[PDB]
Amino acid sequence: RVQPIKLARVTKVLGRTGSQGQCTQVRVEFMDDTSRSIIRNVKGPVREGDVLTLLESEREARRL
Amino acid sequence: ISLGPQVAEGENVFGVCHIFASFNDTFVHVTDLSGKETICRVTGGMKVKADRDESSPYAAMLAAQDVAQRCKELGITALHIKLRATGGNRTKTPGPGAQSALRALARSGMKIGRIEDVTPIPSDSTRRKGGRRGRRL
Amino acid sequence: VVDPFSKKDWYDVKAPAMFNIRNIGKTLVTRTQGTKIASDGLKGRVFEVSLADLQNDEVAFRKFKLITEDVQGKNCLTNFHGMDLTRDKMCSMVKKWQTMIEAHVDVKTTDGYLLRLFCVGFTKKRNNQIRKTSYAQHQQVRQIRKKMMEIMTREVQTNDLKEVVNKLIPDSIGKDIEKACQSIYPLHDVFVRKVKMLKKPKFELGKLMELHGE
Amino acid sequence: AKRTKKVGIVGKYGTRYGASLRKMVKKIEISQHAKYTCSFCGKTKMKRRAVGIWHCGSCMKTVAGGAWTYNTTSAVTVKSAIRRLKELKDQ
Amino acid sequence: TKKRRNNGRAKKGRGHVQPIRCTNCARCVPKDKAIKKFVIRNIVEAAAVRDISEASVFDAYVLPKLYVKLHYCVSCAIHSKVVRNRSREARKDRTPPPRFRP
Amino acid sequence: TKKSLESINSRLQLVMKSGKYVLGYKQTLKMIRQGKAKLVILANNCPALRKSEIEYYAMLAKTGVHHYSGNNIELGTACGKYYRVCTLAIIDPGDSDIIRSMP
Amino acid sequence: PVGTMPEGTIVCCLEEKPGDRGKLARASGNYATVISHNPETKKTRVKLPSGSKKVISSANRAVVGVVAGGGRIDKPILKAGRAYHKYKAKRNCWPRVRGVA
Amino acid sequence: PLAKDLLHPSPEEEKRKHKKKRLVQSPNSYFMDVKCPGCYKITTVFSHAQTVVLCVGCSTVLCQPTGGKARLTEGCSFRRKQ
RNA sequence: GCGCCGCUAGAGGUGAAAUUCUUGGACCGGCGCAAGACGGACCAGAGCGAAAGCAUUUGCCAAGAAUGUUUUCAUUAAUCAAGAACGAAAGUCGGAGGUUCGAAGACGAUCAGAUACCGUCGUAGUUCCGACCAUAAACGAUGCCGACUGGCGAUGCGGCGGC
Ligand SMILES: [Mg+2]
Ligand SMILES: [Zn+2]
Ligand SMILES: [Zn+2]
């Protein structure tokens, strides 16, 4: 709950998802170590090499 | 003080943690080393009010938060895990409330010992509740 | 209304001195309130714990049961109750195209310790074996099943309870029937799987503290 | 000679009382009149006295077995449990 | 028309086999029709391992497995894509599908 | 209940062919008291004082006792005649090994 | 007594308070099953033939078995005569005239 | 194979068939001479025998009769005759 | 399911949902007992059986294919109207039995209308012993017996020869 809301830079664009192409898939890095990664899904145009912000760090991986 | 056994600083006391990772609900019922003394049986299905979202991963995430904020409260430190499922007659693969009720636990500063699938398994018993042609959606 | 954690006290659990690491853990129990006194509210409890947090080197897929037979203040003494394996190791060694064989025997001791000895075993694929089914014939399986219980009758009946439980930490009964079976058909994964206690002899306080000496 | 096909012992009732009753009674009524074999002298001399009592004709020994027969399944199911409790927990 | 060389089932010299029941829809099938799928899934879902292994109480800890034998009925095998409509001159094979672990 | 009664009876029904044997109580009671009896056979259905004095005489004349696990008419086909028999003594078997049996 | 016998055994003709010399489960083919001893506060419970369990004293002397004469009512009376002698040696209650008539 | 001769083949593929189905039927059996260790009488025991064979002098077992071909107790003074 | 302790307000259940269980404290964890079926993973284009059908150990029997056979008997064989035996499941009948599942039926839903798919409950029945009925997609949709006519790797039970 009480966590510092963290900026995050991406690895490669891993394609569209979300049944309409309205989500992308970016798999950010958490700014401190280069081995801590999680596969995620943001909406909006990417431009690989950006820095996006995570409201919280522990939600879900996209696999059913 | 009245909570917490007298333990050294760099060590840890063990209490097992049963995870009932089923369909329609999940339990993150924690207890002592023996299993007997119920310490905190908090449920994902109590903290969501939608009833589609009782089995949901997000409920089982915060289900692990309330028990970890209670685990460190009494004094129990490191949790062996005794993951289950619906078991026996019914399905045995865990529900949505397995990983989110286990990954959220280790992010919540809490040491883990032996995790183990301890769902019940029959030796050919208990005619299943579907009928011959089964339940049909 | 009242906070029920704070009516309790914490003990500590000690195994018998047959093992290396004695400090098992810390059960908790509420105090004496009228009839429910602070001993029989925890005598006979079962403590599931492995071996790798009870020995120094030993493998972790084997676990013991323990039963707190007496409490001497802070200490909570135990005694042997039974052994079993982890299921995910137990059905890791079950493969396709190799025949499971099994035995189950009731063997008591010289002390009043009726025990039920479960041993499984699986046939072995040799180095150069090109065919796939390394099964067995059934008259091989019958006399192999004769060999497996009849060894662990002699492993248990001839001498006392402590050398039974001192034997099977490095799987010495299991490696023993491993040694005499591969003259008939080869076996490679032999685990004395699960021991079920049935009888408890009269609860004499002696043999208990014999295990809680040095 | 074979005199009749589908009465046997209940030909004595004749044309009375029904047909699902006399098909019920001729199973019992051949049983309670039969000479069972005595398990104590090896002879076929078991004779139904008043109900419950059975009595060996020779060896003179009386057994208080079943009511329309000599070993009701309820007795043997129980007897195979009493001699199991004598070894399970040994009391 | 006859569709298959067998009659759809993997038995020849018998007359009766074990009846089992399906996983999801619980439907009774003979044991030698049903589509098995054995699952050896790493129970921690290995993305979530570098978040527990700091919190593990050892260094070299064998993370366990999970051994669940899904054996679907053939009605729910196709609907959940675990098998596929095949073609009439690529039917005749009993080869298992290739792995592609990475 | 499946494969070990061919020991006691197939040894027994061979003496029925060759060796001398006596059925009944008071044939064997003459044979047990003049020494020529060698191995009495007591069925399961003997009365418990017939069972407990032939065992007493067998202690007196130094012979063996086989308890046949079976009814005294089940020993009828084990002999091979259409009687019942609780007690028999075999006194001179031809070439069998009932002396060399389990007791 | 029903304190010594193990649970699940089959008992006829028992006492309802200790020393009563036989009261329960005494008709033909009936049996009370003892279950669930209480080690301290020594009561047991049983299972009387009406399916009602009853906590009784644990020192009720009882006889182990089942009452002979079982399966008795599994033959119809089948005529009016042999019901008259069934109820001539018991009571005088038998020709029961309906209230409506 | 239109061109096989089946009245004068090799005498070795003649062996590689059944005891029937040959050009002429003839058994795998034979009579084999056996000296038991410690006697003087040569024994003419059948090859695929069925009995516990004794000897003239050696009043002990000569062969173990079994499934296909009888098995002598000692690997003994053994020759195949005629 | 019944006890027995521990603990909290829900648990159950579905696409959602309610009937239903519950602070005379269920659900969960633990120690036990009891009763009933059924014998998972090993289990396969393997075996056995005339066919239905057969899977936890040790067990009193009795049967059989196949192979081994310089054994015996010396056409005793093949299919077979009339007629016989065995025959899943359901059904009937009697007595034990009643755990699970569940025809009927009772509700709760979704529906235009649901006497149906789904959910809780639930009788007869699923279980045994005995006495019946001879019907199945009893399918290999291929009668039994016998011979002859391609191959190739492989399989099971024997037998033979071998690094
Ligand atoms: Mg009236
Ligand atoms: Zn008699
Ligand atoms: Zn399905």
Side-chain angles (χ1 to χ4, degrees):
Chain A
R1 186 68 173 87
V2 183
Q3 290 82 242
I5 287 168
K6 175 63 75 71
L7 79 165
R9 188 181 297 271
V10 304
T11 191
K12 293 186 179 182
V13 174
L14 262 291
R16 307 284 89 83
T17 186
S19 70
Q20 282 175 347
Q22 57 188 355
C23 292
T24 65
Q25 171 181 353
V26 289
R27 191 180 294 170
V28 300
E29 282 82 0
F30 291 179
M31 291 296 172
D32 294 330
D33 49 346
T34 61
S35 64
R36 179 174 60 175
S37 176
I38 190 66
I39 180 64
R40 295 184 60 88
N41 43 3
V42 309
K43 72 183 291 187
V46 175
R47 185 184 284 174
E48 172 72 25
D50 57 353
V51 173
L52 61 95
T53 308
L54 299 174
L55 184 139
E56 58 92 14
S57 300
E58 306 90 0
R59 47 179 300 276
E60 184 65 26
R62 180 60 174 83
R63 188 178 174 91
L64 182 61
Chain B
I1 196 170
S2 295
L3 55 86
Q6 295 305 114
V7 293
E9 295 177 352
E11 67 179 0
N12 44 7
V13 64
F14 293 160
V16 303
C17 184
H18 298 83
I19 308 299
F20 186 74
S22 65
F23 289 95
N24 295 318
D25 209 356
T26 180
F27 284 178
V28 65
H29 182 198
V30 78
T31 176
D32 62 352
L33 184 59
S34 69
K36 189 175 185 296
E37 297 292 329
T38 296
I39 300 303
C40 183
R41 190 179 72 239
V42 66
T43 298
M46 298 191 290
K47 294 179 70 177
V48 291
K49 295 278 98 177
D51 197 73
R52 300 173 186 87
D53 293 329
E54 290 179 349
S55 66
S56 178
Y58 179 73
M61 189 274 291
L62 50 85
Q65 292 183 359
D66 184 80
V67 63
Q69 196 261 330
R70 187 72 175 171
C71 182
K72 184 177 84 273
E73 189 269 331
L74 176 57
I76 185 65
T77 58
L79 305 173
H80 301 287
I81 306 298
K82 286 177 71 176
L83 182 64
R84 281 189 60 193
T86 307
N89 191 5
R90 281 81 180 273
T91 181
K92 296 172 187 174
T93 179
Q99 292 304 115
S100 60
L102 197 150
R103 182 178 64 89
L105 197 64
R107 299 301 301 270
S108 68
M110 205 62 67
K111 296 294 181 288
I112 312 170
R114 273 79 183 180
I115 70 102
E116 185 62 36
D117 179 71
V118 68
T119 183
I121 275 91
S123 301
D124 276 337
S125 297
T126 312
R127 301 287 302 172
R128 194 176 177 182
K129 190 256 293 180
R132 175 177 180 85
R133 298 175 291 172
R135 66 176 299 276
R136 297 178 300 273
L137 77 162
Chain C
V1 177
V2 69
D3 196 3
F5 281 168
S6 57
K7 301 292 287 184
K8 296 177 183 293
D9 59 351
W10 293 85
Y11 290 157
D12 58 347
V13 181
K14 301 294 184 180
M18 61 185 74
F19 309 119
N20 286 320
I21 291 174
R22 301 288 301 277
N23 195 1
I24 306 299
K26 295 180 191 295
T27 189
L28 77 162
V29 64
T30 179
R31 298 182 183 91
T32 298
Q33 185 63 257
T35 305
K36 296 295 183 288
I37 58 100
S39 295
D40 59 352
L42 72 156
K43 294 181 188 294
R45 289 185 179 176
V46 168
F47 286 95
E48 200 78 19
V49 72
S50 66
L51 283 179
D53 53 353
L54 188 145
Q55 286 284 318
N56 50 1
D57 59 352
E58 197 73 36
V59 299
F61 60 92
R62 175 171 292 177
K63 49 183 65 173
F64 293 162
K65 288 179 182 293
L66 257 93
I67 11 174
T68 278
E69 284 177 351
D70 202 0
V71 168
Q72 299 300 107
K74 297 298 287 184
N75 290 320
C76 186
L77 301 171
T78 56
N79 188 2
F80 180 73
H81 183 67
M83 59 92 70
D84 49 347
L85 272 69
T86 63
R87 283 194 292 106
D88 55 356
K89 177 65 179 67
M90 182 268 169
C91 65
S92 68
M93 54 193 290
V94 180
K95 304 174 184 178
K96 290 181 69 63
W97 297 286
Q98 63 188 5
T99 298
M100 183 185 75
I101 48 97
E102 54 89 17
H104 58 89
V105 62
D106 289 329
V107 182
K108 68 184 289 184
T109 64
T110 65
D111 203 5
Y113 281 95
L114 177 66
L115 288 177
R116 187 169 289 169
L117 298 167
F118 295 150
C119 58
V120 295
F122 294 93
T123 66
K124 186 176 178 64
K125 186 175 181 181
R126 304 298 301 272
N127 288 116
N128 59 358
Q129 183 169 2
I130 294 162
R131 64 185 291 162
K132 179 166 83 271
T133 72
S134 65
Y135 288 172
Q137 300 176 2
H138 188 80
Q139 282 290 326
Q140 294 179 356
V141 170
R142 291 187 73 254
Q143 74 184 4
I144 286 165
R145 191 182 293 122
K146 187 176 92 275
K147 192 68 175 178
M148 292 167 74
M149 65 186 75
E150 197 272 337
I151 288 177
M152 61 187 66
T153 300
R154 295 180 294 114
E155 298 294 322
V156 176
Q157 183 56 256
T158 58
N159 286 107
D160 54 0
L161 178 71
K162 187 180 184 293
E163 73 96 19
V164 173
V165 63
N166 209 171
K167 192 69 65 65
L168 78 168
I169 306 103
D171 189 75
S172 175
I173 299 168
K175 289 176 71 65
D176 199 1
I177 69 176
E178 168 68 28
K179 183 171 66 67
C181 66
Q182 58 93 29
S183 68
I184 292 170
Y185 201 87
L187 279 74
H188 70 287
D189 283 330
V190 174
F191 291 152
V192 179
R193 178 166 61 92
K194 185 186 174 185
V195 175
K196 187 177 289 185
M197 185 73 72
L198 291 173
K199 298 294 181 72
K200 294 292 179 66
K202 193 182 289 294
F203 184 66
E204 351 168 341
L205 200 276
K207 298 299 192 298
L208 197 152
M209 295 307 295
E210 189 273 338
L211 294 175
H212 293 287
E214 285 287 324
Chain D
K2 184 60 69 179
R3 295 179 292 273
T4 178
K5 66 173 75 63
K6 288 197 288 185
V7 282
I9 192 59
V10 293
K12 69 175 183 177
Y13 300 113
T15 181
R16 297 186 294 267
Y17 309 110
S20 67
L21 284 171
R22 298 179 297 162
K23 194 176 289 294
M24 188 181 294
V25 172
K26 73 171 284 189
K27 177 181 68 65
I28 285 94
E29 202 171 8
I30 55 98
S31 177
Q32 66 170 352
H33 294 169
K35 297 284 187 181
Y36 296 97
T37 303
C38 166
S39 293
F40 292 142
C41 65
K43 292 177 179 178
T44 63
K45 294 293 290 183
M46 295 304 287
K47 182 68 169 65
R48 186 183 172 270
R49 196 172 284 174
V51 61
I53 292 173
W54 289 85
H55 179 268
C56 308
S58 65
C59 85
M60 287 297 296
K61 195 175 287 289
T62 299
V63 177
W68 308 108
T69 178
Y70 173 62
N71 284 317
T72 309
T73 65
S74 178
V76 179
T77 304
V78 169
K79 189 183 80 70
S80 173
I82 304 300
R83 68 102 176 266
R84 190 262 306 165
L85 296 167
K86 184 265 303 299
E87 59 88 19
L88 193 280
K89 202 69 68 178
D90 293 327
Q91 284 289 324
Chain E
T1 72
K2 187 184 287 187
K3 172 168 283 193
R4 296 177 179 89
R5 184 174 179 88
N6 55 357
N7 299 117
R9 290 173 64 251
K11 76 168 183 57
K12 303 295 176 183
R14 301 177 192 89
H16 191 269
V17 286
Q18 295 86 14
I20 58 172
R21 298 179 67 90
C22 177
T23 299
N24 54 1
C25 68
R27 180 251 167 78
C28 181
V29 289
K31 186 173 182 178
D32 48 1
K33 184 188 286 290
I35 303 303
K36 303 180 287 182
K37 181 169 76 172
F38 191 73
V39 174
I40 51 170
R41 179 169 291 182
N42 195 354
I43 178 174
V44 196
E45 187 66 25
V49 161
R50 53 90 48 219
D51 296 331
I52 65 101
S53 184
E54 294 88 4
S56 180
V57 294
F58 288 96
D59 286 329
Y61 175 72
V62 174
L63 281 164
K65 270 70 188 297
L66 178 55
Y67 288 156
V68 176
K69 184 178 281 187
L70 282 300
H71 49 274
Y72 295 102
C73 73
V74 71
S75 179
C76 292
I78 292 170
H79 181 70
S80 64
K81 301 175 293 297
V82 77
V83 294
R84 178 170 288 169
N85 192 0
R86 304 187 76 194
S87 65
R88 307 294 168 258
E89 298 295 328
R91 282 183 177 176
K92 294 180 71 175
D93 54 350
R94 299 170 77 95
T95 177
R99 294 179 66 246
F100 190 71
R101 177 67 64 196
Chain F
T1 66
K2 191 56 75 184
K3 264 91 74 175
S4 296
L5 198 142
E6 195 72 28
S7 295
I8 184 59
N9 63 8
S10 68
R11 286 190 288 267
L12 180 63
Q13 58 89 30
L14 194 144
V15 179
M16 185 55 60
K17 186 260 290 179
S18 173
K20 293 193 264 77
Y21 62 97
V22 284
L23 277 80
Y25 182 79
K26 63 177 70 175
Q27 291 184 2
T28 62
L29 265 297
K30 293 198 291 183
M31 298 299 110
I32 194 65
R33 72 162 66 99
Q34 60 178 351
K36 295 189 264 74
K38 296 295 191 291
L39 185 277
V40 296
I41 295 173
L42 299 175
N44 200 7
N45 206 1
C46 54
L49 85 161
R50 179 173 297 171
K51 193 173 78 69
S52 180
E53 74 171 1
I54 292 174
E55 192 272 336
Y56 184 78
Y57 285 177
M59 179 266 287
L60 286 177
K62 295 295 178 69
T63 67
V65 170
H66 182 79
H67 286 286
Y68 184 79
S69 66
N71 215 161
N72 56 0
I73 59 171
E74 184 180 357
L75 205 149
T77 59
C79 291
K81 55 180 67 66
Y82 297 97
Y83 292 138
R84 55 188 50 81
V85 43
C86 289
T87 70
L88 73 96
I90 41 100
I91 58 173
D92 182 72
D95 54 355
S96 72
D97 45 348
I98 306 176
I99 285 91
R100 289 184 293 266
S101 63
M102 181 271 290
Chain G
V2 298
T4 59
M5 58 180 67
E7 300 88 7
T9 193
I10 295 300
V11 163
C12 70
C13 191
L14 61 90
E15 296 185 354
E16 69 181 3
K17 60 173 72 67
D20 206 3
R21 301 178 73 184
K23 287 295 185 181
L24 304 181
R26 295 173 63 193
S28 69
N30 292 318
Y31 60 96
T33 309
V34 67
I35 54 167
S36 178
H37 288 80
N38 213 166
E40 71 271 15
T41 176
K42 287 189 282 185
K43 273 73 183 304
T44 72
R45 69 179 70 250
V46 288
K47 187 175 175 68
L48 278 316
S50 70
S52 175
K53 65 176 72 68
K54 182 182 184 178
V55 42
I56 65 176
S57 180
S58 180
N60 282 308
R61 190 180 69 251
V63 51
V64 170
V66 61
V67 174
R72 178 187 60 176
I73 61 169
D74 298 332
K75 175 183 181 181
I77 306 297
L78 199 270
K79 67 179 186 175
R82 285 202 293 264
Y84 173 74
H85 297 287
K86 179 178 181 291
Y87 284 90
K88 195 268 288 289
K90 293 185 183 293
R91 265 81 55 87
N92 184 4
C93 70
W94 174 64
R96 187 185 299 271
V97 178
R98 292 176 294 116
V100 185
Chain H
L2 300 176
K4 304 287 175 67
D5 183 77
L6 53 94
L7 204 142
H8 307 92
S10 68
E12 285 79 2
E13 195 266 333
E14 188 74 27
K15 179 63 70 70
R16 304 292 283 166
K17 296 169 73 175
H18 194 69
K19 69 183 179 184
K20 305 292 189 174
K21 292 181 180 178
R22 283 179 177 174
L23 206 281
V24 57
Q25 71 193 12
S26 65
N28 298 317
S29 304
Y30 52 94
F31 289 90
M32 59 185 182
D33 282 334
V34 166
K35 174 62 73 73
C36 187
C39 185
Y40 290 96
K41 187 64 69 177
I42 293 298
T43 306
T44 172
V45 57
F46 188 75
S47 67
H48 297 280
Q50 298 179 8
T51 56
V52 177
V53 178
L54 295 177
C55 180
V56 175
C58 288
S59 65
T60 183
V61 52
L62 184 60
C63 69
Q64 296 292 108
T66 181
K69 181 175 289 300
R71 182 176 296 115
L72 304 173
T73 62
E74 181 70 19
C76 57
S77 176
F78 175 66
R79 68 184 72 252
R80 181 177 173 177
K81 79 190 293 175
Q82 196 268 330

